[PDB]
Design a protein around this ligand. Structure first.
Ligand SMILES: Nc1nc2c(ncn2[C@@H]2O[C@H](COP(=O)(O)O[C@H]3[C@@H](O)[C@H](n4ccc(=O)[nH]c4=O)O[C@@H]3CO)[C@H]3CC(O)(O)C[C@H]32)c(=O)[nH]1
Ligand SMILES: [Cl-]
Ligand SMILES: [Cl-]
Length: 397
């Protein structure tokens, strides 16, 4: 009896049903969301949440845009900060504090990101941070400390790749992995208000990755997630979302390590990219649906819900109270990777919260990165093309 079957039964008997459109395809993220919902729906008297999978996040934004064109929107959806800026163009979003949802205690790294013109429009829900995954066994085998600096990280990848006859730093050639190198080389996407994709720190970041392919220390992954490719050739390291934790744990045939990111110096860890989503509440929803959403949002921000969701997934607990919950404490005392995830969440950067950013990051910036890595395009030429295509897209709206 699958949690989604139990939810279908709950919603059938309910007097009111708030749909929640999401981008979890399966694994621990989809399961944790549904177990949370089952427990919520049990607690209510004929008022229920119905999670509806819409594919991935890009499929979810496409289906939400189509739902507006049809005039049939869900009560709630997942939304990254760029999707919030898009939905605010249509004044489609209910301010969260208008429902009476208390947000005291929500980590300000997460709450500042959902605040637009001083108004909170989203509840942080599944917020990830990039971490350093590694092969504890392969580092021990060659006497290599877990690198704390970018310099150390490059040296380790060179040493281990030479020892093992193959590139040990695995990466997707995408905007998320670029962001780690960009940010920690001192890059910023906004210069005096303007989006800039071809800055010298962008060129430096893409050049480092392309040189790591050429020098035989970096392995581009082109088919599936890094965790779906383990087993083929030697693996030492990747830089990847904390929501990958359970997928890495299931796939790895070696002893898996999680570390804080290599930074410019030992003074501080490297910044990680914040990914994952907020829950938003649509204005088009019925007052009765919005009251369900208010209850469900106060449930999701409860310390026990935050403790169960974060320990099941490797998402970052979004509240201070979650770290004080005994279920979280018992997990963390048995598994030091939860503390390492939280520690990394202190050193956290976001991508621009622009309405156009989904298209930009995938179809323009993502594409320039694949052109340089997979087709050996000059990094500067590839990013100059991305700059002009982004400038054309921004000016057209
Ligand atoms: N639409 C839109 N997408 C965005 C934006 N910024 C980033 N992203 C995408 O969000 C994923 C990170 O979100 P996160 O919740 O941290 O992680 C996801 C999955 O990544 C990850 N996962 C799933 C299966 C698996 O084998 N391994 C695994 O790691 O687990 C989670 C549940 O699906 C990136 C990765 C991507 O999905 O492949 C493309 C990128 C944005 O601004 N807009
Ligand atoms: Cl493996
Ligand atoms: Cl990308």
């Amino acid at each position: 009896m699958k949690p989604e079957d139990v939810i279908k039964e709950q919603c059938a008997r309910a007097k009111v049903v708030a749909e929640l459109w999401h981008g979890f395809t399966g694994g621990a993220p989809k399961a944790a969301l549904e177990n949370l919902v089952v427990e919520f729906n049990k607690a209510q008297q004929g008022r229920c949440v119905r999670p509806v999978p819409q594919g991935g996040y890009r499929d979810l934004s496409t289906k939400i845009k189509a739902a507006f064109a049809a005039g049939k929107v869900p009560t709630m959806a997942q939304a990254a900060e760029n999707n919030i800026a898009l939905y605010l163009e249509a004044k489609a979003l209910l301010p969260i504090e208008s429902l009476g949802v208390k947000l005291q205690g929500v980590n300000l790294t997460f709450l500042n990101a959902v605040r637009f013109g001083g108004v909170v429009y989203g509840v942080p829900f599944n917020k990830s941070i990039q971490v350093l995954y590694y092969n504890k066994d392969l580092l021990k085998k060659h006497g290599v400390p877990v690198p704390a600096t970018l310099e150390e990280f490059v040296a380790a990848a060179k040493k281990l790749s030479r020892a093992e006859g193959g590139p040990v730093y695995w990466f997707q050639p995408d905007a998320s992995t670029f962001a780690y190198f960009f940010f920690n080389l001192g890059g910023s996407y906004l210069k005096d208000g303007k989006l800039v994709l071809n800055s010298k720190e962008a060129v430096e970041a893409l050049t480092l990755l392309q040189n790591g392919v050429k020098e035989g220390w970096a392995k581009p992954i082109t088919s599936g997630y890094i965790n779906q490719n383990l087993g083929s050739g030697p693996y030492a390291f990747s830089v990847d979302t904390s929501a990958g934790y359970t997928y890495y744990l299931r796939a790895a045939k070696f002893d898996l390590g999680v570390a804080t990111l290599p930074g410019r110096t030992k003074g501080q860890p490297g910044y990680g990219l914040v990914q994952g989503t907020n829950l938003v509440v649509f204005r088009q929803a019925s007052k009765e649906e919005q009251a369900v959403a208010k209850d469900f949002l106060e449930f999701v921000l409860s310390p026990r819900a935050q403790a169960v969701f974060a320990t099941a997934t490797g998402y970052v607990p979004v509240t201070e109270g979650a770290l004080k919950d005994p279920v979280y404490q018992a997990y963390a005392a048995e598994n030091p990777d939860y503390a390492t995830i939280v520690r990394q969440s202190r050193y956290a950067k976001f991508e621009p919260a622009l309405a156009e950013w989904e298209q930009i990051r995938f179809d323009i910036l993502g594409q320039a990165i694949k052109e340089a890595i997979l087709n050996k395009a000059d990094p500067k030429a590839a990013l100059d093309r991305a700059q002009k295509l982004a400038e054309d897209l921004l000016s057209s709206r």
